[PDB]
Structures are given as structure tokens and as C-alpha cells.
Design an enzyme around this catalytic site. Structure first.
Site, PDB file in Angstrom:
ATOM      1  N   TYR A 470      27.980  34.094  12.036  1.00 39.92           N
ATOM      2  CA  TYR A 470      27.336  35.255  12.637  1.00 39.92           C
ATOM      3  C   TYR A 470      26.301  34.779  13.648  1.00 39.92           C
ATOM      4  O   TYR A 470      26.547  34.804  14.859  1.00 39.92           O
ATOM      5  CB  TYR A 470      26.686  36.122  11.556  1.00 39.92           C
ATOM      6  N   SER A 551      30.826  41.806  15.101  1.00 40.90           N
ATOM      7  CA  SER A 551      29.686  42.313  15.861  1.00 40.90           C
ATOM      8  C   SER A 551      29.034  41.205  16.676  1.00 40.90           C
ATOM      9  O   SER A 551      29.628  40.703  17.637  1.00 40.90           O
ATOM     10  CB  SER A 551      28.669  42.988  14.935  1.00 40.90           C
ATOM     11  N   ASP A 635      33.782  53.313  16.801  1.00 37.38           N
ATOM     12  CA  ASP A 635      32.710  52.327  16.673  1.00 37.38           C
ATOM     13  C   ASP A 635      31.654  52.650  17.721  1.00 37.38           C
ATOM     14  O   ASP A 635      31.672  52.129  18.837  1.00 37.38           O
ATOM     15  CB  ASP A 635      33.244  50.909  16.837  1.00 37.38           C
ATOM     16  N   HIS A 674      32.429  50.868  13.152  1.00 36.53           N
ATOM     17  CA  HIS A 674      31.930  49.497  13.097  1.00 36.53           C
ATOM     18  C   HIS A 674      32.342  48.789  11.814  1.00 36.53           C
ATOM     19  O   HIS A 674      32.604  47.581  11.832  1.00 36.53           O
ATOM     20  CB  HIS A 674      30.410  49.483  13.257  1.00 36.53           C
TER      21      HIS A 674
END
Length: 704
Positions: A470, A551, A635, A674
Site C-alpha cells: 500500500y 486505491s 466508486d 471502492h
């Protein structure tokens, strides 16, 4: 040999501080045009047959579903004489909220979200019981959108009240202790749609107070900051009900302003914009409310403490010279959260080398009294109010779906008991193990990495790797359970690795700042160094590595395939931010400038232009890895135009490339967003598609 959909090229030149930047697919930013809908349809008509063509797809979906099929529970939360808990029989699209009059009583169905949607695309988002346990407020989100409708029920009967609050988003849910209403956030009317398919920016968030038994048109606007349209007003009522705690944020940094209103000392009822008292009038540090005893408030803070600590601020003498440290900052471990239980006891959760630890402290002195033992993993759930005398907490890890503990807090020894054990049916987890390594990054910084694999693995470079990351927004990627990961390890000979790259919060705010703003490239260097470490130590080879992120992790994947396509064989970027020059112009994207900067700034643009994935697609001597972009048409967190424009540009860049044989595809789901609240059926279908794509691109072998 892949024929990619037609995509009209519209030369659009824009000047960024003297630098001309050209893009060709900005028309894809309009989700409602026939041209964009045709592009989305054509991309799905290309990727769906390719994913369905995986010869082991039925075996894969069946095994993921079978491993997934086990009863799941949340911690039981006491509210009066009743406990409430979420429970999924195994494969329900949404978990069901149950009520029981005591831990030993037969439960009743309190709220089943599956009754609201045939496909489970209606999910809960935010819940709050009234202080007298008689009312229950909850948010509902449709098709995975961030938009929320707040509704109300009587507890424990579950009978509906008529109160309905619309245009709720990123909202508080704080009852006043008179049980007459609650504080919440909403946005005023806007041009166009507000259903999750629009890209309209969200500014000027308001704080309202709704009274039970009235229409929303009668709600009182209690707080607004029109001179700061990006400020967002968090609202919480103190444990005794006297104070409204206002925590104001601008961006995603762990900092906030701290205002308060003495609700009890108010001459009259809530009727207008509330006059507040400023405790902290800046964005220098975090101030997260833990509890209060009268006017003395306990906050978690990072003020001069990058690993966090607890301080006491008394509202009767609130100048900073009077603040006192309650729990010292740890020299190594990050204080993640604190909770007050049984009047004067504190539960403190620390992260030590990406592993959770739990301790019991005294509220009066801050002194440590006991440690609650845990295996290597994460604490993902907690229940334990100041007025009650016991706690529950849920633990999870790579090979442990869940353990729910119960701890009596009434004595001076704290011996937790096992309340529930959540396990996969007919799966021997003892065949696998997790190792933690620390690898040197490009600049020499040592980065932690978990490696989950079968025992007795030999380092011959033959094993396929799923490398996850991430890297940003102070988010720590701690151990958690994944059913599809078990299938990858058991049936596809897989090795799963998480790189705790910089930008996260694994080692505090210094770890976060070392991978944000001008240091964002460090995040990509850490992730590329993780792949190099796995290759050098012969866990795998570059052609067998699949990288995955969501993301901000989708940005990680997009930047890494542009910068080092030779290091990977496959790449799965989910709901990713890919246009780094325009992310701040849509929905809530403006809040991310605290980690990314903004192309509006000359200095920030020089950083962003170097790694913006949409603007850095270039053919190299080594071909790009196989790419699968995953997004949903609802999203509204990361608008799907990010994936659409990146897909159109990357397919055009390699349209005449003899060397590019790996597919570059995307799947755009319907009635999903999302990710939060996505029904179980869609999650299993998505995981099946991910590993089907890997099987077709990196040569996975299925073993029964």
C-alpha cells in the site's frame, strides 16, 4: 495478439507552470456519455472471456467459496441488558446484526441488510446506539457509494422509525444524552447526480443536529466553516454527555483542531450555530478523544511524539502549559488506539514490528498494569465501554481467521478467556508458516516484509509470488486472514508477501513522512526492492511475481510497472489512483493532497509529473507485465476515470508493439464501488478473476 477496444483520441494540451502536458482520453471523465459507456462495455467484453477462459476457473471459484464458507462473528457489544453482534453463516452477502438478552440467550434478528437488496448491494455504513440503548441509528449505502442515508430503529425490537436523513457523507453519528437526537454531517445540494456515479467534488461539509420525530428539513445547522471549504467537522459527545467534542480535519494527515461546546451549560436547547471554545487552533498534531473525568480530558496525540502517547487536557485550564503526559511515548512501538473501560482502566493497543500488543493501564496514573497475551497478528475488533466491566476483542492473522477474547476487568489480574474460535473447515494450516524479514531498500532503509508460504519450501526461484503493498496515509498493513490466499498457497503453489513499505504508519509519523509528498518515490523504491529481494534470495523469479494493491496501492502498482516492468510478470491494480495531476478535482480527492501534494502547486507538480502513472507509460526493452485493472462504476472514492484513462493510454501505447505480448485489460463492475460493503458474492467473483488472470499470465499450476 490482443485486439483492444477503439478509443477516440482527443488532443487536450494543458499548461502546468510552464510545462505542457497532453492527454487524449479526458472524455472518459464523463461517465454518462455514450462514448464512455461503450468504452466500458468493450473493455468488459474483452476481459470477461479472457478470465472465463482460465481452464481451472470452476475449481478456483469452488475452492475459494469452500474455504470462505465458515461462520463469522463480531465481538458482542453490550447495550443495556442486550448484547449485539454481527454474524455471517458463511457465505451471506452481508453480515446480520443480532440481539440477545444476555450472552446465554437465544438471539433475534435485529437488522438483516440482505433483506434490503436481492444482490446484497445495500450495506451498513456507520451505527450508533442511543445512550439509553433504546434507539439505534445506522447508515445505508447503495451500490458501494460513499453516500449514506441515516435511518433509525427502536432497540432491541428493530421496529423502524420514520426518521430518514439524506445527503449524508463522511459523517459523525453522536447522540446527545437526552436521547432526543444526534449530530451528523451532510452536504448541501449540488449540480447533477449524487448516487456514486458522479465525479463532483465534495466541499463545504456541514454539521447538523437532527431531532427524533422531525423531518430532516427541521435539522439545526450547528457548525460550518465556509471560509475553509475543505475542513471536515468530526463530532462526538463526551462519555458523560456534557461536552460536544469537535475534531476538525483538513486532509488525511493524523492531525486535527480541537474545539468543544459545553452542552449542559447552554442556556437553551440546540437551535442554531453553536458557540464553541478552541482548545487547539492549528493542524500541528492529532488529538483523539479517549475519555474524560469531569473537565479533565484524555487524548491520544502525536505532538512531539511520532509513535504517539496519551495526554491530559483540562478544559478548565486548557493552555498548553497545563497539559500533562498520561502515558509516555514508547521508544519503539506505535500506540495505535486506547479505550477506557470500567470507569478508570485503559486498554492500549501497540504495534511492535508490525505486530499488535495489548496492555491494561490505569486511567488515574497512566501506569502499566498487565499485558493481554496475543499470538502474532492484529486486533481488528474491540468492545468495552467506560460504564461496563468487561471487554471483548477480536484477533486475526495470516493463518487464523479469528479469535474473540473476553476479559473481566473487575479484578487486579487480567486473564482473558477465549470466547470464540473462527476457523476454516477442513484445512490444515499447520502446513504453512509466516516469516518476517527486513530487506534493504534502494537508499539502505530496512523495510519489514511478511512471507507466508508452505513449510519446507526450497529457494529455487520456482515459486509464484503475490506481492502486496500500500504505502501511504499512515496506514499500517498488519497481518489479516484471506481465504483466497489459502487457496493460492494450497492449490497454486503460491507464496504471499506483504512489504511494509514507507508512507504507512508501521513505525509512526516518521515512517509516514518518509513516504509521502516529495518522498513518495521512496514508496515505489521500497516495493521494487521487495521484489528484488525475493528474486535475489531465490523465492521466485521476475516472470513469476504478481504485484497487487488497492486505491493508493493501485497507484503503487501503476508506478511500479512504469518504472520497473522487468521486475514483474503480472500486475493487479484495484480501484487505483492513476491520474496524479487531476485526482484532487473529483469527489473527495482533495483530501489526499496531504500525501500527494497537488498539481496546482509548482513545487508539487515537479514531484507528481515524475511518477503520475497516466503520464509515464513508456515502452522499454522489457515488456510490461500483464495488467488487470479492477474498478466499479459506483466508486466515488477513487472515480473510475483513473482506471479508464490509464487503460486507454496503455493499450494505445503498445498497439503496434511487437514485444508486448502480455495482456493489458480491465474489469468495470456494476453496482459496486471502492470496496467497503461489497457483497460476498462480488468479492468471491473478484478474487476468482484475480487468480484466473494470474493463472493465464504467469503460468500457475493447479494441484488438487
Amino acid at each position: 495478439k490482443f485486439t483492444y477496444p477503439n478509443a477516440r483520441r482527443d488532443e487536450l494540451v494543458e499548461d502546468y507552470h510552464g510545462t505542457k502536458v497532453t492527454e487524449y482520453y479526458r472524455w472518459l471523465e464523463d461517465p454518462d456519455s455514450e462514448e464512455t459507456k461503450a468504452f466500458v462495455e468493450a473493455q468488459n467484453e474483452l476481459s470477461k472471456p479472457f478470465l472465463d477462459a482460465c481452464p481451472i476457473r470452476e475449481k478456483l471459484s469452488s475452492r475459494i467459496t469452500e474455504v470462505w464458507d465458515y461462520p463469522k462473528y463480531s465481538c458482542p457489544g453490550r447495550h443495556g441488558e442486550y448484547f449485539y453482534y454481527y454474524h455471517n453463516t458463511g457465505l451471506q452477502n452481508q453480515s446480520v446484526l443480532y440481539a440477545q438478552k444476555g450472552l446465554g440467550a437465544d438471539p433475534s434478528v435485529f437488522l438483516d441488510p440482505n433483506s434490503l437488496s436481492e444482490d446484497g448491494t445495500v450495506s451498513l455504513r456507520g451505527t450508533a446506539f442511543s445512550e439509553n440503548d433504546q434507539f439505534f441509528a445506522y447508515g445505508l449505502s447503495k451500490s458501494g457509494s460513499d453516500w449514506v442515508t441515516i435511518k433509525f430503529k427502536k432497540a432491541p425490537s428493530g421496529e423502524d422509525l420514520p426518521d430518514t436523513l439524506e445527503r449524508v457523507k463522511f459523517s459523525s453519528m453522536a447522540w446527545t444524552h437526552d436521547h432526543k437526537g444526534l449530530f451528523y454531517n451532510r452536504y448541501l445540494e449540488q449540480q447533477g447526480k449524487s448516487d456514486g456515479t458522479e465525479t463532483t467534488m465534495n466541499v463545504d461539509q456541514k454539521l447538523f443536529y437532527h431531532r427524533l420525530g422531525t423531518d430532516q428539513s427541521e435539522d439545526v445547522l450547528v457548525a460550518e466553516f465556509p471560509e475553509h471549504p475543505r475542513w471536515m467537522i468530526g463530532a462526538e459527545v463526551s462519555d458523560c454527555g456534557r461536552y460536544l467534542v469537535m475534531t476538525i480535519h483538513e486532509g488525511c494527515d493524523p492531525v486535527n483542531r480541537l474545539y468543544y461546546v459545553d452542552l449542559k451549560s447552554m442556556q437553551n436547547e440546540i437551535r442554531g450555530v453553536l458557540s464553541y471554545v478552541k482548545i487547539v487552533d492549528n493542524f500541528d498534531a492529532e488529538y483523539e478523544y479517549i475519555t474524560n473525568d469531569g473537565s479533565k480530558f484524555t487524548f491520544k496525540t502525536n505532538l512531539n511524539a511520532s509513535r504517539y502517547k496519551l495526554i491530559n487536557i483540562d478544559f478548565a485550564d486548557p493552555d498548553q502549559s497545563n497539559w500533562q503526559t498520561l502515558v509516555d511515548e514508547d521508544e519503539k512501538s506505535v500506540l495505535e488506539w486506547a479505550a477506557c473501560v470500567n470507569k478508570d482502566k485503559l486498554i492500549l493497543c501497540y504495534l511492535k514490528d508490525v505486530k499488535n500488543e495489548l496492555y491494561v493501564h490505569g486511567l488515574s496514573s497512566g501506569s502499566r498494569m498487565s499485558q493481554l497475551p496475543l499470538e502474532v497478528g492484529s486486533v481488528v475488533g474491540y468492545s468495552g465501554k467506560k460504564k461496563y466491566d468487561e471487554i471483548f476483542y477480536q484477533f486475526t492473522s495470516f493463518l487464523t481467521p479469528g479469535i474473540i477474547y473476553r476479559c473481566d476487568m473487575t479484578t487486579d489480574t487480567y486473564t482473558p478467556k477465549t470466547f470464540r474460535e473462527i476457523k476454516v473447515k477442513d484445512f490444515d494450516t499447520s502446513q504453512f508458516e509466516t516469516e518476517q524479514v527486513f530487506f534493504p531498500s534502494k537508499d539502505g532503509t530496512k523495510i519489514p516484509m511478511f512471507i507466508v508460504h508452505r513449510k519446507g519450501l526450497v529457494h529455487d526461484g520456482s515459486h509464484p509470488v503475490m506481492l502486496y503493498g500500500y504505502g501511504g496515509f499512515n496506514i499500517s498493513i498488519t497481518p489479516s486472514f484471506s481465504p483466497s490466499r489459502l487457496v493460492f498457497l494450497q492449490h497454486l503453489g503460491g507464496v504471499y508477501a506483504i512489504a511494509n513499505i514507507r508512507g504507512g504508519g508501521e513505525y509512526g509519523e516518521s515512517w509516514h513522512k518518509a513516504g509521502n509528498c516529495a518522498n513518495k518515490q521512496n514508496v515505489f523504491d521500497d516495493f521494487q526492492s521487495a521484489a528484488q529481494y525475493l528474486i535475489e534470495n531465490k523465492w521466485t523469479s521476475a516472470k513469476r511475481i504478481t504485484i497487487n494493491g488497492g486505491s493508493n496501492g493501485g497507484l503503487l502498482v501503476g508506478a511500479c510497472i512504469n518504472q520497473r516492468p522487468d521486475l514483474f510478470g503480472c500486475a493487479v491494480a484495484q480501484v487505483g489512483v492513476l491520474d496524479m495531476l487531476r485526482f484532487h478535482k473529483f469527489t473527495i480527492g482533495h483530501a489526499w493532497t496531504t500525501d500527494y501534494g497537488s498539481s496546482d502547486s509548482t513545487d508539487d507538480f515537479k514531484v507528481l509529473i515524475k511518477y503520475s502513472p497516466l503520464h509515464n507509460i513508456r515502452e522499454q526493452k522489457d515488456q510490461y507485465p500483464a495488467l488487470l485493472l479492477l474498478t466499479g462504476d459506483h466508486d466515488d472514492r477513487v472515480v473510475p476515470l483513473h482506471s479508464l484513462k490509464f487503460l486507454a493510454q496503455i493499450q494505445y501505447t503498445f498497439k503496434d508493439s511487437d514485444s508486448q505480448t502480455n495482456p493489458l485489460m480491465g474489469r468495470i463492475d456494476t453496482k459496486s464501488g471502492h470496496g467497503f460493503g461489497k457483497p460476498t458474492a462480488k468479492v468471491i467473483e473478484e478474487l476468482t478473476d484475480i487468480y484466473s488472470f494470474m493463472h493465464q499470465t504467469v503460468g500457475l499450476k493447479w494441484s488438487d
